[PDB]
């Protein structure tokens, strides 16, 4: 029923061969929205990131009747995403 898209937010910096960054998250604000799913892992308001696990801040997923409508749900939620303290693959 319709289409669905997943992508994952990590502490990988695209400007540096996708190295997993280590540090404290000082600001975390996510999206939410109808047909948006945010499975959270390392990305929250407080505690820092250990270098010893596959980096996963938030798993993000969107869903609507058409691929284009689900894609425009995906960009919006990616644009609403705000993480400072570490680098992210969001751009």
């Amino acid at each position: 029923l319709g289409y669905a898209i997943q992508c994952r937010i990590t502490t990988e910096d695209p400007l540096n061969d996708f190295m997993p960054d280590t540090g404290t998250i000082i600001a975390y604000r996510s999206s939410g929205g109808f047909g948006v799913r945010l499975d959270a892992g390392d990305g929250f308001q407080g505690a820092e990131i250990s270098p010893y696990y596959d980096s996963l801040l938030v798993k993000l997923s969107t869903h609507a009747i058409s691929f284009k409508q689900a894609e425009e749900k995906m960009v919006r939620s990616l644009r609403e995403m705000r993480i400072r303290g570490v680098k992210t693959n969001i751009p």
């Binding site: 929250f44 308001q45 407080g46 505690a47």
Partner: protein, 90 residues
């Protein structure tokens, strides 16, 4: 219970006051002694054992200045969750 009953007969005021305190603050037995007598220090984290495999992870971040009511704001983090508690400064 029966324990309640002779407890109150043995100790009227004292028992009543314990109930008053329990309603207000819950079961204090479980706090470690230093926390029971002194509370917590800024940036301190404390484990309270509740049951096997069950514990409270409380971190005290800071305490605010008394606002225009003498109410200070304590910024907490309980089990990975931002929390605010307002206390009358005596």
């Amino acid at each position: 219970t029966e324990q309640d009953i002779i407890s109150y007969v043995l100790y009227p005021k004292v028992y009543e006051q314990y109930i008053q305190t329990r309603n207000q603050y819950g079961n204090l037995s479980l706090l470690d002694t230093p926390t029971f007598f002194f509370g917590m220090r800024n940036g301190e984290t404390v484990e309270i054992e509740i049951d096997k495999g069950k514990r409270l992870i409380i971190k005290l971040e800071t305490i605010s200045e008394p606002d225009e009511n003498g109410n200070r704001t304590i910024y907490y983090a309980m089990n990975g969750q931002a929390r605010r508690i307002y206390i009358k400064d005596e």
